[PDB]
């Protein structure tokens, strides 16, 4: 019987960099489940960065505050069940500087706009987070998720603390 091995918040197994003639720091090696496990709920920790772009890791637990962005973003559920709520902003420029990049925390209070819909993600499901929408998450049990985004006001960097230095 074929068994495909997936990670989870409470069940992962880090590999790492084996050295011949290098510095393990060059490979910026971490495990996204570990990063999520040690963070505040909905804290978005950069696990990858290339110029301005980032991949962020986060533990979904309880209900998030609202987010919006001046560009598209994508979220990939990695572990448990995560609910996504989408709201079409009446004046999105009231909450997000159009010149800004990366997600903006726009408050716990309900912003003004129309209901777009609801998404329920399980492990391995990706949803779009469209520019001009506000979004928020609800997870009953802790679950892990990743963001394809740009570094901005919500992006927490802590490389020395999450990466292998061997």
């Amino acid at each position: 019987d074929v068994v495909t091995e997936f990670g989870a918040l409470t069940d992962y197994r880090k590999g790492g960099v084996e050295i011949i003639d290098d510095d393990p720091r060059n490979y910026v090696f971490s495990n996204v489940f570990e990063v999520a496990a040690n963070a505040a709920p909905y804290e978005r920790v950069a696990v990858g960065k290339n110029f301005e772009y980032v991949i962020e890791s986060a533990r979904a637990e309880g209900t998030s505050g609202w987010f919006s962005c001046a560009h598209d973003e994508f979220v990939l559920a990695m572990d448990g069940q995560i609910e996504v709520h989408l709201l079409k902003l009446d004046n999105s420029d009231a909450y997000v500087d159009p010149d800004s990049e990366g997600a903006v925390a726009i408050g716990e209070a309900l912003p003004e706009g129309r209901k777009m819909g609801r998404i329920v993600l399980r492990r391995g499901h990706m949803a779009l987070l469209p520019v001009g929408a506000a979004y928020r998450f609800y997870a009953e049990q802790p679950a892990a998720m990743l963001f394809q985004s740009i570094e901005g006001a919500v992006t927490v960097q802590k490389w020395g603390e999450i990466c292998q230095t061997e």
Binding site: V2, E5, F6, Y12, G15, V28, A127, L128
Partner: protein
């Protein structure tokens, strides 16, 4: 930049056609791909060769350096391409024995495609893992033009959006691979309010990857500016050693891979990176890398598609490692 390529004779005994591009010559026999250029020669086992050729063709010369092996490969200049022998080999370079020629891309690509078609025989799929396909050995025997002509799949924004690249199903020709038989196939629950159905969108990405019909083929599934999520399913050995002209990132989504990491310029071994589910690491712009995977596994390759990067890395205005700590 050169444009001169040529179909040579069908060999009477082997049944295969021989080919020329600039100063380079291509011939295969029962076992081998035989390369010549002004001043030298090289042999690559035909299976290894066809697997690598298949990638360089499917990827449109990809990014940076696609090394077929420790001697032969290509450098993508994006509209133009360099083909080389020993350019990234310390032995050839120290001796001034490396050779390279610069081509217009569609000129080298057209002869690469002709090579791949002529040299691929009945029942051999150079895009598959060895357990999934036949053998390339012997004299010319039919062809496999279907396997080598697969249509490239790229999302403009995200898989499954109206008018974007579609979800994979049994009905559209993509069943689940045998080594992903246990992977959950359900789609995420999507419920849009009236008028918003075009923009409330989600899909099962792991199930999408479970249905990929090829190995080692990064395909764009979601886009944010120049930032590309290019996941793929992998098995056996990456048929090339990739020396990128930018930094790139790997996130292991299932099972595991080891990356054999060598110096881009010299080819000297430098590290081996073992990645299991959830591991994310970066490949520096001064290394080349080649992956190994026992079981068919899911991998996310994350690229920055910006054309400014290579001249920046060259100048030292962009770092060879994206982050230091």
């Amino acid at each position: 930049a050169r444009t001169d390529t040529e179909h040579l004779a069908i060999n009477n005994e082997t049944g295969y056609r021989s080919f020329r591009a600039g100063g380079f010559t291509f011939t295969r026999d029962e076992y081998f791909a035989r390369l010549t250029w002004p001043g030298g020669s090289h042999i690559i086992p035909i299976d290894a060769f066809l697997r690598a050729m298949m990638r360089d063709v499917a990827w449109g010369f990809f990014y940076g350096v696609v090394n077929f092996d420790h001697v032969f490969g290509t450098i993508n200049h994006y509209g133009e391409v360099t083909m080389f022998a020993g350019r990234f080999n310390d032995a050839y370079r120290n001796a001034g024995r490396d050779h390279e020629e610069r081509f217009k891309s569609s000129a080298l690509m057209a002869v690469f495609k002709d090579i791949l078609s002529d040299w691929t025989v009945e029942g051999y799929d150079p895009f598959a893992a060895p357990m999934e396909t036949g053998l390339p050995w012997g004299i010319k025997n039919g062809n496999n033009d279907e396997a080598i002509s697969r249509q490239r799949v790229t999302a403009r924004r995200m898989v499954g959006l109206p008018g974007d690249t579609p979800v994979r199903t049994d009905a559209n020709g993509f069943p689940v691979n045998r080594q992903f038989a246990d992977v959950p196939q359900e789609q995420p629950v999507v419920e849009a309010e009236p008028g918003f159905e075009a923009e409330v969108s989600a899909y099962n990405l792991f199930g999408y990857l479970s249905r990929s019909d090829v190995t080692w083929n990064p395909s764009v599934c979601s886009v944010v500016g120049d930032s590309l999520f290019c996941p793929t399913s992998e098995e056996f050995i990456l048929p090339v050693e990739h020396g990128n002209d930018r930094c790139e990132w790997f996130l292991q989504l299932s099972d595991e891979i080891v990356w054999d990491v060598k110096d881009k310029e010299s080819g000297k071994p430098r590290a081996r990176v073992t990645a299991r589910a959830g591991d994310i690491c970066c490949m520096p712009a001064d290394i080349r890398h080649q992956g190994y995977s026992t079981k068919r596994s899911m991998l996310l390759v994350w690229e920055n598609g910006s054309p400014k990067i290579p001249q920046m890395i060259a100048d030292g205005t962009a770092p060879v490692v994206p982050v230091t700590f």
